[PDB]
């Protein structure tokens, strides 16, 4: 649609926050780049 709702953006960022830390633990195989 466009996403002008700033809250929704931080909501999707809320999924990215743990994503970054979990990649730091490198619990994921190979990982991508969370540093």
CA distance 3 to 9: 7
CA angle 14, 30, 28 (to 5 degrees): 45
CA distance 3 to 33: 26
CA distance 26 to 8: 27
CA distance 11 to 31: 23
**How many Å is the maximal CA-CA distance in the chain?**
35
DSSP labels for 1-35?
-----HHHHHHHHHHHHHHHHHHHHT-SSS-----
Nearest of 23, 18, 21 to residue 33 by alpha carbon:
23
Residue 20, exposed/middle/buried by CB under 10 A (0-12, 13-18, 19+)? exposed
CA distance 27 to 8: 27
């Amino acid at each position: 649609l466009g996403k002008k709702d700033t809250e929704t953006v931080y909501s999707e960022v809320r999924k990215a926050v743990p994503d970054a830390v979990e990649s730091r633990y490198s619990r994921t195989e190979g990982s991508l780049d969370g540093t």
